[PDB]
Design a protein around this nucleic acid. Structure first.
Lengths: 134, 58, 266, 107, 53, 85
RNA sequence: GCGGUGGAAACUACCAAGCUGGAGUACGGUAGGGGCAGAGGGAAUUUCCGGUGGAGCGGUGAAAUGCGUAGAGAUCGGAAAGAACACCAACGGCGAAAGCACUCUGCUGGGCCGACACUGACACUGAGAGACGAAAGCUAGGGGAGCGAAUGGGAUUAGAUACCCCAGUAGUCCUAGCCGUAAACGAUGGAUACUAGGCGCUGUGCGUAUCGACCCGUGCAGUGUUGUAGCUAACGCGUUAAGUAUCCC
């Protein structure tokens, strides 16, 4: 099926950090490769590379965990989509969300490219809010 | 090892106990794949009266 | 109805809906009865009139033997309701025979000893496995009587019986008749054909027989019972002439007595 | 055409030579239409568990105790399978005529 | 469905205990009463489920 | 059987194998016209009705797909198999 | 907020040309009470007839109604008929649900695996709508062994127009049409992607040549688990979750 490939990556990373795994393999698409790029520039993951299973192109996604405790603290506590297919959210320059007061950011696809919460405010542009990471 | 062959009276009479009732899972040592296929060979061999339905022990 | 070709039922509109026949005939008829319930001196047993009759036809015993057939088309005959077709033996003997069930397309149809059992023609019971479906048995070795009413004409058997006697008549219980007899081996005549309802008489009842109901209608002479303001002394023996409707029982013999056995009476 | 094996549950009335003539009447039925035969296995006179068709519209003192069993492994047309079992049951012999579909090739 | 007394010798011993294992009152107490139709496939298979493991 | 599956792939023209919107529909129409002729004799059947509504529903998705690509291969198809429209 | 103009173009959408993991199909095999139709097989029950033979049988917590010396039951031989079909049956299997099991033939549906070959997203869900519906019940025509609403007796009881006993009609069975309801219950709608593990089915690959009952994998469907995290009011569920998410009713 795959109704939204932008929504299954959010589910594949969220369930992977809860049961502490090293590498996850998600589907290869240009828009999803743009989300993993602005994830490592802020520092939410290690790095991203290209891979291939059986004629199908997949993307390597290595996660990062903190120090050892009873249950080691995770990088991303919650991952959720705002612009769900069938409920498309659109915002301007003033309606841009302030996630956690500056600690967490919200990644949005703008007209100039792919900007974050701080990057879209400095350019003076808005668009479709994909998801919010914290 | 013949499961489909109903014409072998000497082999299938070892499967059937002293009674005309068909064997259980504990005896003969056969799985559910070998079963049902052998019971269909017994049910067929019974109409030909090689193996009786209600076999009298004596 | 439970089978194909459901019986047509005239919807409401004006009590009932009569009709007006129109067909043709091709020989195979003498004149049939045309004098109404009489005797030449005394009518006897009232109830019986109305025109619309005639057309008799024959063919019952069937003396032919190992001869193939080919049922041409179907056909209906007055009085008895169960078709009669017209068949067509291999040679070319114009007959009728009681229309079995699945045919019309000719089929097999054949009589004589040692023939394909199904619904052909005559076939001596002497050569019959069980006989779960016969047709019209005969009291003797030459006649063609008994249940001739193809429709519902049933009479099972008892597999294989000796002494040359079996047959399992319907409401007539079971009896013993010669085994050296033969039948159509059909035991079919359509049940839905008689399942239909008359309607409201007039142009469906009288056209076959006079009123079937009489009633007390008083008059101690006109009928053994009667009289009174309106009510009738029913139950107090009121049958037309010493009859006795409360069962009683009849048919008494000693030598040529009934050879039927079992005969349950609830 | 398909491979068939009809086992005629032969009634103890017909003898050894009378079963072999029915195998020759079998040849004039199928081979005379673009078919063939393999072989015949005669099991012998083996007694019944229950006396079937002891008497069906016959005399009171008659019991069918014994019985012979034989399977005809052949090759015939799929349309000539129904009038085959009907041509067998019409005779005063044979209790049951059951047709089987075989996938295994018998030598 | 009978019993074996195929052994010879003029012995007076019963040997009716040999068939009282397979046949017994078991095949007659499972029968001869009234069938439940649905509770025979439900209740009789529910008690054998918990007694298995 | 195998005769009805080998004739459908060689009669109509399209350079590919069984994977074609032209070969798949005549394979389904051959399964519908023989199943409706089965329902004339076996009118007492209930389980073969769900297999008739499935194959009719699978054909309606393939015929609606051919209307979206080009109307040249669609008009030459529906007139050869003799269906409505 | 609406409209218009000049731009930006990632995403959604439109158009064109594709790709393939979706879905579908073909090739070759496997299992199954899937369904419909037509046959045929065995035990038993009931009934009819005859033989033998005796006064009891049947039934209950006790009894009685009932069947018995115009002689049952029991027993043996034969016939007729209807229904369901032991064992195998299994924590089994198949089906959308309901539901479906003795054997055989004829027509027919779905699911799954495997080297692959091909299309190419042709997808998912889905108000209305259409179709299927355990049993009971209804219409017409058949059939009717047993069971058994009703109903009739015996008994129990303070009373029982119940439970229990002896009988017994509709019905239960078949064809056709109709009614469409059930703790129609896993009471957890369908479809897809992810998330610790330990034991039980069916296909297929492989394992000194498979020397063996078997050993090591890899798929479908299916139980239980002191089942973990998590979820839950709790009970409990637990990758066939009421776990984490998406699509739609």
């Amino acid at each position: 099926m795959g109704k939204d490939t932008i929504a299954d990556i959010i589910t594949c990373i969220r369930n992977a950090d809860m049961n502490r795994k090293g590498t996850v393999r998600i589907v290869s698409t240009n828009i999803t490769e743009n989300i993993v790029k602005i994830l490592l520039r802020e520092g939410f993951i290690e790095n991203a590379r290209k891979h291939q299973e059986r004629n199908k192109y997949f993307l390597v996604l290595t996660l990062r965990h903190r120090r050892n405790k009873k249950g080691p603290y995770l990088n991303t506590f919650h991952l959720k989509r705002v612009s769900r297919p069938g409920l498309r959210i659109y915002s301007n320059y003033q309606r841009i969300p302030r996630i956690l007061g500056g600690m967490g950011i919200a990644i949005l696809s703008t007209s100039r490219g792919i900007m974050t919460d701080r990057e879209a405010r400095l350019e003076g542009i808005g668009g479709e809010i994909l998801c919010y990471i914290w | 090892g013949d499961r489909i062959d109903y014409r072998n009276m000497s082999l299938i009479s070892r499967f059937i106990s002293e009674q005309g009732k068909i064997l259980s899972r504990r005896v003969n040592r056969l799985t559910l794949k070998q079963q049902r296929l052998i019971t269909s060979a017994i049910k067929q061999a019974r109409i030909l009266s090689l193996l009786p339905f209600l076999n009298n022990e004596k | 109805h439970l089978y194909k070709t459901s019986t047509s039922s005239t919807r409401n509109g004006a009590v009932q809906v009569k009709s007006n026949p129109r067909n043709n005939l091709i020989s195979g008829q003498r004149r049939c009865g045309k004098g109404r319930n009489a005797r030449g001196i005394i009518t006897a047993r009232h109830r019986g009139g109305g025109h619309k009759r005639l057309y008799r036809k024959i063919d019952f015993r069937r003396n032919e033997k190992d001869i193939y057939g080919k049922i041409v088309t179907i056909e209906y005959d007055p009085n008895r309701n169960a078709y009669i077709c017209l068949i067509h033996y291999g040679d070319g003997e114009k007959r009728y025979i009681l229309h079995p069930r699945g045919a019309i397309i000719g089929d097999t149809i054949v009589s004589g000893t040692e023939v394909p059992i199904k619904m052909g023609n005559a076939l001596p019971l002497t050569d019959m496995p069980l006989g779960t479906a016969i047709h019209n048995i005969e009291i003797t070795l030459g006649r063609g009587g008994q249940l001739a009413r193809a429709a519902g004409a049933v009479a099972k058997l008892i597999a294989k019986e000796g002494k040359s006697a079996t047959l399992k008549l319907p409401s007539g219980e079971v009896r013993l008749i010669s085994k050296n007899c033969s039948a159509t081996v059909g035991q079919v005549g359509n049940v839905g054909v008689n399942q239909k309802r008359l309607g409201r008489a007039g142009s469906k009842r009288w056209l076959g027989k006079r009123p079937v109901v009489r009633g007390v209608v008083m008059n101690p002479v006109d009928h053994p019972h009667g009289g009174g303001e309106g009510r009738a002394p029913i139950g107090r023996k009121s049958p037309t002439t010493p009859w006795g409707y409360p069962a009683l029982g009849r048919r008494s013999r000693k030598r040529n007595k009934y050879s039927d056995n079992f005969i349950i009476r609830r | 055409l398909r491979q068939y094996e009809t086992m005629a549950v032969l009634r103890p009335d017909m003898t050894e030579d009378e079963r072999l003539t029915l195998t020759q009447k079998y040849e004039e039925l199928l081979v005379a239409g673009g078919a063939m035969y393999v072989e015949v296995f005669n099991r012998g006179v083996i007694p019944l568990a229950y006396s079937i068709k002891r008497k069906n519209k016959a005399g009171e003192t008659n019991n069918y105790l014994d019985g012979i069993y034989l399977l005809f492994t052949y090759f015939t047309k799929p349309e000539s399978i129904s009038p085959l079992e009907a041509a067998l049951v019409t005779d005063d012999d044979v209790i049951r005529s059951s047709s089987f579909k075989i996938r295994k090739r018998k030598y | 469905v009978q019993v074996v007394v195929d052994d010879n010798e003029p012995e007076e011993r019963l040997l009716n205990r040999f068939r009282r294992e397979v046949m017994r009152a078991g095949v007659i107490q499972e029968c001869k009463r009234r069938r439940f139709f649905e509770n025979t496939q439900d209740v009789r298979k529910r008690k054998t489920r918990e007694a298995a493991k | 059987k195998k005769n009805s599956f080998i004739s459908v792939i060689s009669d109509e023209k399209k350079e590919e194998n069984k994977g074609s919107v032209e070969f798949q529909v005549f394979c389904f129409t051959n399964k519908i016209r023989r199943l409706t002729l089965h329902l004339e004799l076996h009118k007492k059947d209930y389980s073969s009705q769900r297999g008739l509504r499935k194959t009719l529903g699978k054909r309606q998705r393939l015929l609606a797909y051919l209307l979206k690509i080009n109307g040249v291969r669609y008009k030459e198809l529906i007139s050869k198999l003799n269906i409505r429209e």
